Structure formats: C-alpha cells, structure tokens
C-alpha cells in the first residue's frame, strides 16, 4: 500500500526519545538532575 505509511508511528516514538535524550544530556552536563528549567519544580523550589 502507498497512500501513506503507518510506520510513521515509529517516527513519533523517536521524537519522544530525542526529547528525553536532550534533557538527559543537559542533566549530564551540569550535574543537576533538576534542570534550571521548571521540570520537577518542587525540588527546584
């Protein structure tokens, strides 16, 4: 079949993966598991 590719579902998953990847790298750079970003704002506060 040609009209589209259901396997773009694969793509979606990778977008999530890359998001996680980048955030992990941030945490690995600074050593701060709570980014200076809002994320987990409780511990941040």
């Amino acid at each position: 079949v040609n009209t589209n590719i259901a396997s773009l579902n694969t793509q979606r998953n990778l977008n999530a993966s890359s998001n996680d990847l980048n955030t992990s790298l941030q945490r690995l750079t600074t050593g701060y598991r709570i980014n200076s970003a809002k994320d987990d704002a409780a511990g941040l506060q």
């Binding site: 079949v1 040609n2 590719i5 396997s7 694969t10 793509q11 998953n13 990778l14 993966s17 890359s18 996680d20 990847l21 992990s24 790298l25 945490r27 690995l28 050593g31 701060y32 598991r33 709570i34 511990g43």
Partner: protein, 48 residues
C-alpha cells in the same frame, strides 16, 4: 549542602545507562525507518 545534592546531584552513573538507551533508540528506530520506507517502493515496483 549534602541535601542540596541529594535533590540536584544526578546519580548520572545511572543516567549514563539511560543515556545509552536513548542514543540506542535513536539509532534503532532510524534503521527501522530506513527499512520501512522501502516497503511502498517494493509494493508498486512489483504490482507494475
């Protein structure tokens, strides 16, 4: 201060493993896509 690290200080000796997993996924799903986008090509090349 020790508390401040227990809050912030990533146990990156674990997050390294998480990191590999993410890199790994990028690689894998990619290769899957390099395979996936060959499917319709085959379909039509043959039915023609």
């Amino acid at each position: 201060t020790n508390a401040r690290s227990r809050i912030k200080d990533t146990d990156f000796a674990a997050e390294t493993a998480a990191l590999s997993k993410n890199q790994v996924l990028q690689q894998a799903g990619t290769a899957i896509l390099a395979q996936a986008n060959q499917l319709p090509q085959a379909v039509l090349s043959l039915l023609r």
